């Protein structure tokens, strides 16, 4: 869920408030997304949107009526590393991994304020 | 909460159903507990009851109206090891550790069916 993803990105970027800093960035970081990623942080977001859309094709995920930003899973953050728990059932485990990967991606790319609240005419 | 503790003990003992196998064992494994532990598994349970009672003295825990078996925290199980997450606030982090320790204790001691549903006249 949204609230596990928020903490995974602060696990990796402790100075950040992910829901403010990474929301509404580029063409993909945020609800939906279309067009060409404007940079690498945006490409991180596009890959995560594709991961979430892959998750929805999983038959395990067909039973999950709570769709991905409300679908709760388990993970821990320890010494700024993220671990998806084995108690996750297959669907939750797929979304956890989607989230792990996007948070780690976000910590490896530049952040460009120019792209914050980027006008949609760009996507 | 009860449901995080159940999974921590299956993290460590994967063949088990903790809520059936360790409930109502000796004088301490179960709600409450008084008397002398009948064995080492029971002493594991006494130490965990003392941990939970220590937790209740914490000032952090004073705000937690949901008392410990409903007080949810985060942890992961990976390769049969348990890790209490850093996103746990202090109270939850104290209970998580109480639970980590009891699950690891339960995996290191003998299990004695004689003590299963042990008559209270014994405690
Ligand atoms: Ca998006
Ligand atoms: Ca007890």
């Amino acid at each position: 869920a949204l609230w596990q993803f928020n903490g995974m990105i602060k696990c990796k970027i402790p100075s950040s408030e992910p829901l403010l800093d990474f929301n509404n960035y580029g063409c993909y970081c945020g609800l939906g997304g279309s067009g060409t990623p404007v940079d690498d942080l945006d490409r991180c977001c596009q890959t995560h949107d594709n991961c979430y859309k892959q998750a929805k094709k999983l038959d395990s995920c067909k039973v999950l009526v709570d769709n991905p930003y409300t679908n709760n899973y388990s993970y821990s953050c320890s010494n700024n590393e993220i671990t998806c728990s084995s108690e996750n059932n297959a669907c939750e485990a797929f979304i956890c991994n989607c989230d792990r990967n996007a948070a780690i991606c976000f910590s490896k790319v530049p952040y460009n304020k120019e792209h914050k609240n980027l006008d949609a005419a760009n996507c």
Side-chain angles (χ1 to χ4, degrees), chain A:
Chain A
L2 199 280
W3 317 97
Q4 283 90 51
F5 191 27
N6 179 250
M8 292 198 169
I9 301 157
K10 297 164 80 184
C11 180
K12 285 285 168 178
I13 309 180
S15 53
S16 164
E17 284 302 348
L19 261 38
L20 306 177
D21 297 336
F22 292 91
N23 204 8
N24 263 94
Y25 183 102
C27 295
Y28 289 95
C29 307
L31 255 88
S34 49
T36 300
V38 301
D39 59 15
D40 292 341
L41 175 46
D42 209 21
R43 196 129 246 147
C44 293
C45 292
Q46 185 192 44
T47 302
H48 180 248
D49 295 0
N50 289 331
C51 199
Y52 267 20
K53 262 309 175 177
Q54 179 49 42
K56 302 188 192 79
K57 285 167 180 62
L58 272 61
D59 296 319
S60 319
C61 290
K62 312 269 79 33
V63 184
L64 286 302
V65 66
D66 60 349
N67 274 253
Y69 75 127
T70 26
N71 203 357
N72 279 302
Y73 52 74
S74 294
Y75 82 102
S76 61
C77 174
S78 190
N79 279 10
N80 307 108
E81 168 69 322
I82 308 155
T83 305
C84 284
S85 180
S86 48
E87 249 77 73
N88 285 330
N89 284 328
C91 188
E92 297 101 272
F94 188 87
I95 290 155
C96 187
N97 190 64
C98 289
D99 294 348
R100 259 233 342 166
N101 283 3
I104 291 167
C105 191
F106 292 1
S107 70
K108 308 291 195 167
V109 293
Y111 184 89
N112 296 308
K113 279 173 164 206
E114 297 84 342
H115 293 328
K116 196 63 242 296
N117 278 285
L118 181 269
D119 182 47
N122 279 275
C123 301

